[PDB]
Amino acid sequence: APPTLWSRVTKFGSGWGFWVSPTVFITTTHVIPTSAKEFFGEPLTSIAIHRAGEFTLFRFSKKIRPDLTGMILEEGCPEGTVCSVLIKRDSGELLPLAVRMGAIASMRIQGRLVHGQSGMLLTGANAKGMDLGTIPGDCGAPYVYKRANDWVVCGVHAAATKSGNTVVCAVQ
């Protein structure tokens, strides 16, 4: 995946977030530090925070990542799109996990009620564990795929099943 997409993936709370543009940051609601009143020098009052369940979008009043171009964010992707989940792991290792995306689903995962776009990992048969699958630290990592000439971001990692094979992408 292009170095410009990896540059957007930022360590955030208990996981990650993704810079869509110099002013727009998206992440999984449950990774957000709950008592936080300041982000990248900016007070709460000066940021527009839009929340739909496990999807959260921050719009800043000043450019935080002016090195970046604005890119397309969509509400999930067509069934059967193959996406890459842009996961960073211990030691500047980059893990773009291949996922075939399915239907919008409501599920119960480790007792918690989750809603988003469902997907099945294409890494291996029994992908439980950090080698072929996701870990809780990966939440907020973006789901991306290439169209004609460009890349699209369509959501953020919200959950995975006990088996590891199914993942859920929270969507705008």
Next chain:
Amino acid sequence: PTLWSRVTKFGSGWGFWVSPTVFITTTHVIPTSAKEFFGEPLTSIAIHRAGEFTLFRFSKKIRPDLTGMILEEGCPEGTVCSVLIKRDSGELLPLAVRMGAIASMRIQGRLVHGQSGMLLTGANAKGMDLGTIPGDCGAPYVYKRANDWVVCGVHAAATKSGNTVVCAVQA
């Protein structure tokens, strides 16, 4: 703490540490001019070649940090393996491959012998991280069975289309 630390850059491709003393790789990626590997003089390195499968056994522990893993001669037909691809970008690309028959295949001219497989990543990559490239040769094929990781060979070749892969196997 990981399968991925066993995947090592080597010659024109990659290899895999099965134990502290045992390294496996694709024959065609090995340097043809050398007096040592991993600082060990070739003097003291046992080399077992079988077509596109090569095993090295060292006289001392090169990777004492590792436990020994199960190495088998291919896997049962229809096993879904993972090819653990390392790229010079810093990317790790585990791709699912449905394994088939032992066969000889015409793969871009040459005949290659080993266990055939097909990538389960879809039709074509189209410039996404979904297929193998020539530089990936030597990457290991692994699957989980009970609590155990099994390695059953090394990436020897892929078709133009990317669809078909050849896993070179022991013996």
